[PDB]
């Protein structure tokens, strides 16, 4: 009844959803054929037969990552008109995602969204999975978020982005694509959840004791995040939280809407024992700076709003016993104007484990969604990676020749400079 | 989708491609006849990029083989995998270039180029959505330099939005293989800077070292050199033909590696390269494949990268491997060699991983390096050019074919306009 | 009891009926031998034995397409005096269909009609299947519709025409044959349903996922149209509709009687799943401009009367829930004088699937018959194709030499100009 | 029904027809004797159009073979498929035309034409409902030009409502095969414009290119040229003899392709045309058959269509294929070549599809093109005519046979009245 559709843009967006829709089918007993041998209605529309299909739009400008879904295990699950392919990728070109190739199938994608929104009766919002590095996840998403705010406007549009790491990069023009995609998604997206690869590389090595983590394994941890956010919709909880409540509790200013996700417990099977995992133990794990999933130091900043989404065997008095200690600790400091920096959610359902997964079966979990000042250090790097490249006008002819103006980069950089001084304006205390 | 039309020019471009279509047919499990005989459907999933499907469940290569003499094509069509090509594609003349750029670009090339482009236009319309054209030729010869660079100027006018990557065998520092190769190179680099989106400089002197030092081959033939070139060539488009965990293509390697539209002259590298005995005494890990690429003795372009700075670096990997193990090593070579990479491009390493390995290997890498180290490649040729041109030596074999001295004065100034740009962005802060 | 005979003119008319009478025999359990191992009386007269024959007249001036029926699967079904052949075709010559060859067997065809009309006790009207391109479907039909209005007059004569596409043509003199056949059928035919090939080429490629559709496959979709129109006669419905009701609800002016058909759902077997196909889903498919079967843009015009003919598992309250939303949508606009632009029909019987067919088995269907202003763009092309050819007097000697006057083309063009300004007169709003 | 009486005139018209009745007898499964030996009843469904059924379950061709010398008929009746014709139909004289139009149309032709028409009237009354007469002849010879065009003027007076299509072998640009062929052509085109509903101009120079370039025949004989003519000839009436999904006949091709009653001079084309080796390296699809027709090097009339505009275009297809795949390609060649088609005929492409393929092929096409490009065919002949006539050269071989100079002055003015009409509707807007 409280339906929520999802969009998957770019190669990063599809491979995340390949783990997410793997995870959702195990939480509801759903076969890969759509079979199951009433709470699943928020993601699964029902057919006339006993077959359920997901409310998902997989879009890419190149057909390779889509065809592996079309030939993979989940061939029989997805509606084949939802698996949208272009011909040529945007190919790490924001202009090709936004002007050249993206305009060719943007009317096809909005058509598939509008067919999903008509069969939804209580549609809450959107889950856009993309990245900041690739041209599709930057250009086509920013083209798409322009169109969804025109057609809907008041729906709560959520993004789950793959933020580019400080020292770990896979593409050279990642500083170009990330600045350009944020200048457009700023006035449109309501709350964009940053996720970094290097921090999950830190977590999969240390916390999971995996020597060699794969992109299969990183997408499992992002799936546990998005499942725990929509756990209160898909299941009955002791204290529920809707997607409309997240943008209310976490976004103090319309510019600052970039929290960073954090999941706990992340332990292997050999460490599934040897600790009891109380709600005090898993909550102190989240505010520990080594366990976050964006490479930022929260001790170098201040939290503005934290959102603890518990699930499973969770006792609400022990929740308050866990949380009230953290406000006393000096390493967790808040901003002066925010005495109430907490939103707490509890679900009765534990997170299940995917077979072949690296996480272990735990009785309780927590998905921290914390908006902090410490992300301003991440944007201070990314402008510094931008200002070194753009001063020599590197790679600009790849973007000018695809329809973009050279003066548009000065618009995106000065606006990002205006976004950078917003955290400095919020991060200071109040006079008198 | 995203189909590639392979064009071969010159004796060298044919002998590379005849080994190149040996590798592609072995990767896709294709017999000498043209029929599929692999095991998995992943080989036929993206079969259409280098192949048209003919009737009777046979595949023909989407290749256009061009020469000016019939001596090389008769070696192609009679050898192994020569019966797979369409006999319409062999567009050869009779006169031969005579190891001359002017005879390849003006006189004998123009009497054949209209019969080539009609085969190009026939193969381009047979493509569903064309990705772009790859060309294999040399810069020392006459056909690969003349007829090859004549094909680029005609195609870019007809197909401007497509990528035009050339695999140019650039002449060597120590030895020559042609007396007029400073004339054939400089007149071709004039045509490469204006009409190619990227160009992979390969030197035969460098492959002589890699076959001797690294592979421990005492007697390497041309068939052993071209298998190292074709391992790069299939490794560039291996993410376009197969699923990977981070897919690249010819446009991702174009945008990431070309910061300025003239500066698109690359050096390739391949890893692993082991001998017969020396392969069981080595662990094939991603930190081993990483450190084998970024040294000097694995560069297929005969210039030490330590004399310059890498502008941009692409590392296309093949086989099942872990991304952290990749992304640590791509970071690891940037920290310890921060003076060796250019400073004003932070994080100048492009990463690509294909899931399908080469045949008989657990994992493999394909290095694409864009450095300022190839300014010495053009400092040497422009010095060898100016030494010959100031005496007007061999000028009458080109002046007699419709050319003036003003063509040389522009082409030599264009290369010194190119050398001054690599020197500009090497000293840039 | 409510009998309705059908006429099939030209090669297009016969090949449509080869799928239509294939379809009718499967809906009533009729073998190709006329056997079945009381509602079929509207198309099948009964013999003394247990053998039923169709009320059909197949007429062509060339014997090739008739002899394939005489040697095909349905040899034993048809009365061999109904399979009328000429000797030479009209051969894309309207004058040869109307003056030269058509006069030779027009008395034979009217004799076979009059033998069918005598054994009908409640004869409602005619179903003339023809095309606008061929000389037989243009010349012989226009000769026939002159004669049936003389002999009957008050019977409701319906046409199902193959309208010539804008860019897809099979004959060169299609602009000549289409203008000449419409000048004659205007004052005689009560309601002529336009069908285009290019729009079914669009539907069979996109909606059916067929790479290579055949004229076998296009005639299946036209058969599903004509079956769903006569579904209310041949079967008992919750809300029935007779052929006399179609000309009443859809024809506001005696000139404008050219609706365009639209069928839904058109989905394959792999897309038979992955959607639930409510009556809200299949009704929004019809008013979508990509799913109509005449290449016209209804967003460039206004609907004058729409006729939704539902069949199968259809609930009449959900019908009103589907239809009332469409009047609110801006892309569907009506003419100012027509507040009630709807005729709704519901049948209890689902459309069955022909074996070897490309459509899938669905529980419900809809045949939209919508008269719109957007067909005036189609006639504006066809006069423009006429005015370029006729100004140089191209091909006129093929028509003058077969008995036609050269001044007759100026009569047909000025009348079509008078028909073109009728849509401009209707398409405007009312003063005060 | 719709029967066709085939008439052959000249040495050329006999040697085409002797190959043509080889193709028809192979399509209908007819033995050398005349008896049916096929497999399906579709061959006997429309057997009556080119055959009369004789007693004893044998079929004779409805053919009338006319010559003025017995040299060619003795080659016909003694070769393969010569024992199938009726010996009454071989109406040959003894004197021979002498490669002369006046001896073919006035002196020796008129001494035989009454013995031909009585065989024509015998075959016409044996037809149930006659469709029309097809004639095979040349325009360079004496019998095919003289006796052939004498048969057309006598038949059109007797049978005005029937179609009279001729397959005229028009002389070549580069070579001649007759010194007085500008005289034989122009005096025949005078008779073709007034009494033929359509005429298919075939050039021997064009078939020399198609056998060499397209079919890769190094040594093509006349029997290899006539198999390409007969593949067109059976492809014109293939929808009349077999069921199709869009049937055409000789009257549909008459009405659609002749916008003005003089301008009925066509160029034919056939597809596919492949070599022995080059046929397995090619996919036989409708977009391949389409692009093979509309170029220059597949025209059987030696003129480039790019020098003019197509007025009307007919494409008769054979074999099971899909109509959208057809109708897209017929649209596709009209969009990209909109300057190459005439503007004031919108959608000038006639489509016809027969379900029955040729023997040994999956699908096939038959192109019928009516262009302004054959104005150069008549600009060349009228220039070759006027150069010879202004010196009155070879005039006494025609003046001695009953002709005056006024016959030439009208025939030359009639062709310049024809050239000025193709130039009129090429410049028409
Ligand atoms: N977390 C996570 N990130 C991924 C995964 N796969 C790719 N990425 C990220 O995707 C980013 C590049 O964007 P892509 O999705 O690969 O490219 P794209 O969005 O399709 O745009 P194109 O350049 O046109 O291909 C890289 O920086 C990776 O960090 C994955 O499996 N998990
Ligand atoms: N929808 C549909 N249209 C067809 C089919 N077959 C032929 N047509 C149409 O028929 C039109 C030509 O008319 P025909 O029926 O072939 O010719 P005719 O009416 O018999 O008149 P003649 O020219 O004398 O043969 C073409 O424009 C085609 O669009 C078919 O199977 N389905
Ligand atoms: N890598 C490689 N290079 C070759 C081979 N054969 C010739 N070359 C190079 O090609 C150059 C000569 O060009 P060539 O193609 O023979 O002259 P062309 O035919 O007129 O273009 C020489 O500098 C050689 O270094 C080969 O098998 N492998
Ligand atoms: N296509 C074709 N043309 C021929 C053949 N034999 C002769 N011709 C042509 O016929 C012309 C000569 O006409 P011909 O019939 O021999 O003279 P006639 O007997 O007096 O009519 C020459 O121009 C030849 O080009 C043949 O086998 N095939
Ligand atoms: Mg991608
Ligand atoms: Mg017909």
Question: CB distance B322–A212 less than 8 Å?
Answer: yes
From CA D148, how far away is CA B353, in angstroms rounded?
75
Q: In this structure, is the dihedral angle defined by the CA atoms of residues D227, D232, D234 and D238, taken in order, positive or negative?
A: positive
CATH code, domain carrying B413? 1.10.287.600
* Strand B310-318 to B364-371 pairing: antiparallel
Residue D358 shares a structural domain with residue D388? no
Q: What is the CA radius of gyration of chain B?
A: 21
What are the residues whose beta carbons fall under 8 Å from the beta carbon of C291, sequence distance 6 or more?
Answer: C203, C207, C262, C264, C266, C285
From CA B183, how far away is CA B173, in angstroms rounded?
15
**Under 8 Å between Cβ of B272 and B285:** no
Place of tokens 């065919």: D377
CA atoms within 13 A on the CB side of C372: 28
CA atoms within 13 A on the CB side of C250: 29
From CA D251, how far away is CA D256, in angstroms rounded?
8
Q: Is D14 in the pocket of ligand 4 (CB under 6 A)?
A: no
User: Which residues on adjacent β-strands are paired with residue B65?
Assistant: B8
**Under 8 Å between Cβ of A114 and A97:** no
From CA A13, how far away is CA C20, in angstroms rounded?
48
CB pairs under 8 A between B and D: 28
Q: How far apart are the first and last CA of chain D?
A: 42
Name the residue of C13, C93, C137, C177 to mutate for ligand 2: max ligand atoms within 8 A of Cβ. Answer: C137
Whether C278 has its CB under 8 Å from any CB of chain A: the answer is: yes
Question: CB distance B243–A392 less than 8 Å?
Answer: no
Listed by number, the residues of chain D in 92-151 with a beta carbon closer than 8 Å to a beta carbon of chain C are 128-129, 131
What are the residues whose beta carbons fall under 8 Å from the beta carbon of C289, sequence distance 6 or more?
Answer: C297, C298, C299
Closest-approach residue (CA) in chain B for D278: B87
CATH number corresponding to C1-259: 3.40.50.1440
Question: CB distance B245–A167 less than 8 Å?
Answer: no
One-character DSSP codes across C367-430: EEEEEEGGGHHHHHHHHHHHHHHHHTTTTTHHHHTTT--THHHHHHHHHHHHHHHHHHHHHS--
Nearest atom within ligand 2 for CA of residue C61: 24
Residue B184 shares a structural domain with residue B308? no
Residue B161 shares a structural domain with residue B304? no
Whether the upstream peptide bond of residue D14 has omega within 30° of 0, thus cis, is no
Q: Give the domain-ending residue among D259, D286, D315.
A: D259
Q: Which listed residue (C198, C245, C377, C420) is catalytic?
A: C245
CATH code, domain carrying B134? 3.40.50.1440
Nearest atom within ligand 4 for CA of residue D14: 15
Taking the CB of residue B404, how many other CB atoms lie within 10 A of it? 10
Question: CB distance A48–C270 less than 8 Å?
Answer: no
Q: Do domains C260-374 and C375-432 have the same CATH topology?
A: no
What are the residues whose beta carbons fall under 8 Å from the beta carbon of B332, sequence distance 6 or more?
Answer: B287, B290
Residue B123 shares a structural domain with residue B9? yes
DSSP assigned state of C100:
I
From CA D29, how far away is CA B256, in angstroms rounded?
65
C260-374 maps to CATH 3.30.1330.20: yes
Start-end of H helices in D99-169? 101-102, 113-126, 148-158
Q: Is D237 in the pocket of ligand 4 (CB under 6 A)?
A: no
Superfamily grouping for domain C375-432 = Helix hairpin bin (1.10.287.600)
From CA A63, how far away is CA A80, in angstroms rounded?
13
Q: Is A93 in the pocket of ligand 1 (CB under 6 A)?
A: no
Pocket of ligand 2 (CB under 6 A): C 10-12, 15-16, 60-61, 89-92, 131, 133-137, 162, 170-171, 197, 215, 218-219, 222; D 246, 252
From CA C351, how far away is CA C228, in angstroms rounded?
8
* Strand A260-264 to A364-372 pairing: antiparallel
> Could you tell me the two tokens for B61?
């290569």
Q: What are phi and psi of A274, to 5 degrees?
A: 65, 10
**Under 8 Å between Cβ of D59 and D254:** no
User: Which residues on adjacent β-strands are paired with residue A59?
Assistant: A9, A84
Residue B163 shares a structural domain with residue B279? no
Taking the CB of residue B429, how many other CB atoms lie within 10 A of it? 8
Place of tokens 């709560």: A156
Question: CB distance D243–C392 less than 8 Å?
Answer: no
Question: CB distance A79–C271 less than 8 Å?
Answer: yes
**Under 8 Å between Cβ of D320 and D355:** yes
**Under 8 Å between Cβ of A197 and A133:** no
Residue B165 shares a structural domain with residue B99? yes
Q: What is the CA radius of gyration of chain C?
A: 21
What are the residues whose beta carbons fall under 8 Å from the beta carbon of A121, sequence distance 6 or more?
Answer: A1, A3
Residue B202 shares a structural domain with residue B327? no
Ligand approaching nearest to the C-alpha of D70: 4
> Could you tell me the two tokens for B242?
């197969």
What are the residues whose beta carbons fall under 8 Å from the beta carbon of C201, sequence distance 6 or more?
Answer: C168, C213, C218, D324, D327, D328
For chain A, the chains sharing at least 3 beta-carbon pairs closer than 8 angstroms are: B, C
> Could you tell me the two tokens for B195?
């009409």
From CA C262, how far away is CA C295, in angstroms rounded?
11
CA atoms within 13 A on the CB side of C127: 27
**D370-400 as b/e, with b when 16 or more CB fall inside 10 Å?**
bbbbbbbbbbbbbebbeebbeeeeebebbee
Closest-CA residue to B406 (of B218, B205, B109, B187): B187
How many H helices and E strands in chain D?
16, 14
From CA D373, how far away is CA D296, in angstroms rounded?
11
Question: CB distance B86–D275 less than 8 Å?
Answer: no
Q: For residue C62, report the distance from its CA to the centre of ligand 6, in Å.
A: 7
Taking the CB of residue C356, how many other CB atoms lie within 10 A of it? 8
Taking the CB of residue A356, how many other CB atoms lie within 10 A of it? 8
**Under 8 Å between Cβ of A53 and A34:** yes
Can you give the resolution of this entry in Å?
3.7
From CA A178, how far away is CA B76, in angstroms rounded?
49
Three-class secondary structure of residue D416 per DSSP: helix
Name the residue of C101, C131, C172, C193 to mutate for ligand 2: max ligand atoms within 8 A of Cβ. Answer: C131
Q: Which of B324, B350, B428 sits opposite A205 (nearest CB)?
A: B324
Closest-approach residue (CA) in chain C for D264: C395
Q: For residue B12, report the distance from its CA to the centre of ligand 3, in Å.
A: 4
Residue D15 shares a structural domain with residue D33? yes
**Under 8 Å between Cβ of A68 and A83:** no
Residue B160 shares a structural domain with residue B207? yes
Active site residue C245: yes
For chain C, the chains sharing at least 3 beta-carbon pairs closer than 8 angstroms are: A, D
Q: Mutual orientation of helices A174-185 and A141-151 as an angle, nearest 10°? A: 0
Residue D268 shares a structural domain with residue D401? no
How many structural domains is chain D composed of?
3
Q: Give the domain-ending residue among D329, D352, D373.
A: D373
Nearest Cα of chain B lies from the Cα of A298 at a distance, in angstroms, of 24
Q: Which listed residue (A46, A146, A198, A245) is catalytic?
A: A245
Q: What are phi and psi of C61, to 5 degrees?
A: -85, -15
Ligand approaching nearest to the C-alpha of B9: 3
> Could you tell me the two tokens for C312?
């199968």
Whether the upstream peptide bond of residue A265 has omega within 30° of 0, thus cis, is yes
Ligand approaching nearest to the C-alpha of D233: 4
Q: Mutual orientation of helices A407-427 and A376-391 as an angle, nearest 10°? A: 150
**A250-265 as b/e, with b when 16 or more CB fall inside 10 Å?**
bbeeebbbbbbbbbbb
Q: Which of D247, D252, D345 sits opposite C389 (nearest CB)?
A: D345
Domain of residue B343: give its range. 260-373
Which run of H or of E encompasses C305?
strand C303-312
Q: Is A134 in the pocket of ligand 1 (CB under 6 A)?
A: yes
A135 annotated ligand binder: yes
Q: Give the domain-ending residue among B259, B292, B313.
A: B259
Question: CB distance C167–D347 less than 8 Å?
Answer: yes
From CA D33, how far away is CA A264, in angstroms rounded?
92
Nearest atom within ligand 1 for CA of residue A11: 15
From CA C177, how far away is CA C137, in angstroms rounded?
9
For chain B, the chains sharing at least 3 beta-carbon pairs closer than 8 angstroms are: A, D
Q: For residue D14, report the distance from its CA to the centre of ligand 4, in Å.
A: 9
Place of tokens 């000769």: C143
Ligand approaching nearest to the C-alpha of D251: 2
Q: What is the residue extent of each domain of chain C?
A: 1-259, 260-374, 375-432
Taking the CB of residue C245, how many other CB atoms lie within 10 A of it? 15
Closest-approach residue (CA) in chain B for D287: B126
DSSP assigned state of B299:
B
Closest-approach residue (CA) in chain C for A77: C274
**D166-201 as b/e, with b when 16 or more CB fall inside 10 Å?**
bbbbbbbeeeeebebbbbbbbbbbbbbbebbbbbbb
What are the residues whose beta carbons fall under 8 Å from the beta carbon of C250, sequence distance 6 or more?
Answer: C191, C257, C259, C304, C305, C307, C343, C369, C371
User: Which residues on adjacent β-strands are paired with residue C371?
Assistant: C305
**Touch criterion met for D and A (3+ Cβ pairs within 8 Å):** no
From CA B198, how far away is CA B134, in angstroms rounded?
10
Residue D161 shares a structural domain with residue D22? yes
Nearest Cα of chain A lies from the Cα of C209 at a distance, in angstroms, of 10
Taking the CB of residue D154, how many other CB atoms lie within 10 A of it? 17
Q: What are phi and psi of D390, to 5 degrees?
A: -75, -15
**Under 8 Å between Cβ of D326 and D365:** no
CA atoms within 13 A on the CB side of C37: 1
CA atoms within 13 A on the CB side of B88: 21
What are the residues whose beta carbons fall under 8 Å from the beta carbon of C109, sequence distance 6 or more?
Answer: C7, C57, C59, C84, C144
Whether the upstream peptide bond of residue A242 has omega within 30° of 0, thus cis, is no
Three-class secondary structure of residue A322 per DSSP: helix
Three-class secondary structure of residue D347 per DSSP: coil
**Under 8 Å between Cβ of C320 and C326:** no
Residue B282 shares a structural domain with residue B342? yes
Question: CB distance D281–B87 less than 8 Å?
Answer: yes
């Amino acid at each position: 009844m409280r339906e929520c559709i999802s969009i998957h843009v770019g190669q990063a967006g599809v491979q995340i959803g390949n783990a997410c829709w793997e995870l959702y089918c195990l939480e509801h007993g759903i076969q890969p054929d759509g079979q199951m041998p009433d709470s699943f209605n928020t993601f699964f529309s029902e057919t006339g037969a006993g077959k359920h299909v997901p409310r998902a739009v997989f879009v890419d400008l190149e057909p390779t990552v889509i065809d592996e879904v079309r030939t993979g295990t989940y061939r029989q699950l997805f509606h084949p008109e939802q698996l949208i392919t272009g011909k040529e990728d945007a190919a790490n070109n924001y202009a090709r995602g936004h002007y050249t190739i993206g305009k060719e199938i943007i009317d096809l994608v909005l058509d598939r969204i509008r067919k999903l929104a008509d069969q939804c009766t209580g549609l809450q919002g959107f889950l856009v999975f993309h990245s900041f590095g690739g041209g599709t996840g930057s250009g086509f998403t920013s083209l798409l978020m322009e169109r969804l705010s025109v057609d809907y406007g008041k729906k709560s549009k959520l993004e789950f982005s793959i933020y580019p790491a400080p020292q770990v990069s896979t593409a050279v023009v990642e500083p170009y694509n990330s600045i350009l995609t944020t200048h457009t998604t700023l006035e449109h997206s309501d709350c964009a959840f940053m996720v970094d690869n290097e921090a999950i590389y830190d977590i999969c090595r240390r916390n999971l004791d995996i020597e060699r983590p794969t992109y299969t394994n990183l997408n499992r941890l992002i799936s546990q995040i998005v499942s725990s956010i929509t756990a209160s919709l898909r299941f009955d909880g002791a204290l529920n939280v809707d997607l409309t409540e997240f943008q209310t509790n976490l976004v103090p200013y319309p510019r600052i809407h970039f929290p960073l996700a954090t999941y706990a417990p992340v332990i292997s099977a050999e460490k599934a024992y040897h600790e009891q995992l109380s709600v005090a133990e898993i909550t102190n794990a989240c505010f520990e700076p080594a366990n976050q999933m964006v490479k930022c130091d929260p001790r170098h900043g201040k939290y503005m709003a934290c959102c603890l989404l518990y699930r499973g065997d969770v006792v609400p008095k022990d929740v308050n016993a866990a949380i009230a200690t953290i406000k006393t600790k000096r390493s967790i400091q808040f901003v002066d104007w925010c005495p109430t920096g907490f939103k707490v959610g509890i679900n009765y359902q534990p997170p299940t484990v995917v077979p072949g997964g690296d996480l272990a079966k735990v009785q309780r979990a927590v998905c921290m969604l914390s908006n902090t000042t410490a992300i301003a250090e991440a944007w201070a790097r990314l402008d510094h990676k931008f200002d070194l490249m753009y001063a020599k006008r590197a790679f600009v002819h790849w973007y000018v020749g695809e329809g973009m103006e050279e003066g548009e980069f000065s618009e995106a950089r000065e606006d990002m400079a205006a976004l950078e001084k917003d955290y400095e304006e919020v991060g200071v205390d109040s006079v008198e | 989708m995203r189909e590639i039309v392979h064009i071969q020019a010159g004796q060298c471009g044919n002998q590379i491609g005849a080994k190149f279509w040996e590798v592609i047919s072995d990767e896709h499990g294709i017999d000498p006849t043209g029929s599929y005989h692999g095991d998995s459907d992943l080989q036929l999933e993206r079969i259409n990029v280098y192949y048209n499907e003919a009737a009777g469940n046979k595949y023909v290569p989407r290749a256009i083989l061009v020469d000016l003499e019939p001596g090389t094509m008769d070696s192609v069509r009679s050898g192994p995998f020569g019966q797979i090509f369409r006999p319409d594609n062999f567009v050869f003349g009779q006169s031969g270039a005579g190891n001359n750029w002017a005879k390849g670009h003006y006189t004998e090339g123009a009497e054949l180029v209209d019969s080539v482009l009609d085969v190009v236009r026939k193969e381009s319309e047979s493509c569903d959505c064309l990705q772009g054209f790859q060309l294999t030729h040399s810069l020392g010869g006459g056909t690969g330099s003349g007829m090859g660079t004549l094909l680029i100027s005609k195609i870019r006018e007809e197909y401007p939005d497509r990528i035009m990557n050339t695999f140019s065998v650039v002449p060597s520092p120590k030895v020559s293989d042609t007396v007029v190769e400073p004339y054939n190179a400089t007149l071709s680099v004039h045509q490469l800077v204006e009409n190619t989106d990227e160009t992979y400089c390969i030197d035969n002197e460098a492959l002589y070292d890699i076959c001797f030092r690294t592979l421990k081959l005492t007697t390497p033939t041309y068939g052993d050199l071209n298998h190292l070139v074709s391992a790069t060539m299939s490794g560039v488009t291996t993410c376009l033909r197969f699923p990977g965990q981070l897919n690249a293509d010819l446009r991702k390697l174009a945008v990431n590696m070309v910061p300025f539209p003239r500066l698109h002259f690359f050096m390739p590298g391949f890893a692993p390269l082991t001998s017969r005995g020396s392969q069981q005494y080595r662990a094939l890990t991603v930190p081993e494949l990483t450190q084998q690429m970024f040294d000097a003795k694995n560069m297929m372009a005969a210039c030490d990268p330590r004399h310059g700075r890498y502008l941009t670096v692409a590392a296309v990997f093949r086989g099942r491997m872990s991304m952290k193990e990749v992304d640590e090593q791509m970071l690891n070579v940037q920290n310890k060699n921060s003076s060796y990479f250019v400073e004003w491009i932070p994080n100048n390493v492009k990463t690509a991983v294909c899931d399908i390995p080469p045949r008989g290997l657990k994992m493999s890498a394909t290095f694409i390096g864009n450095s300022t180290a190839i300014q010495e490649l053009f400092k040497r040729i422009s010095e060898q050019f100016t030494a010959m041109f100031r005496r007007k030596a061999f000028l009458h074999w080109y002046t007699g074919e419709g050319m003036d001295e003003m063509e040389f004065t522009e082409a030599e100034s264009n290369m010194n306009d190119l050398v001054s740009e690599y020197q500009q962005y090497q000293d840039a802060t």
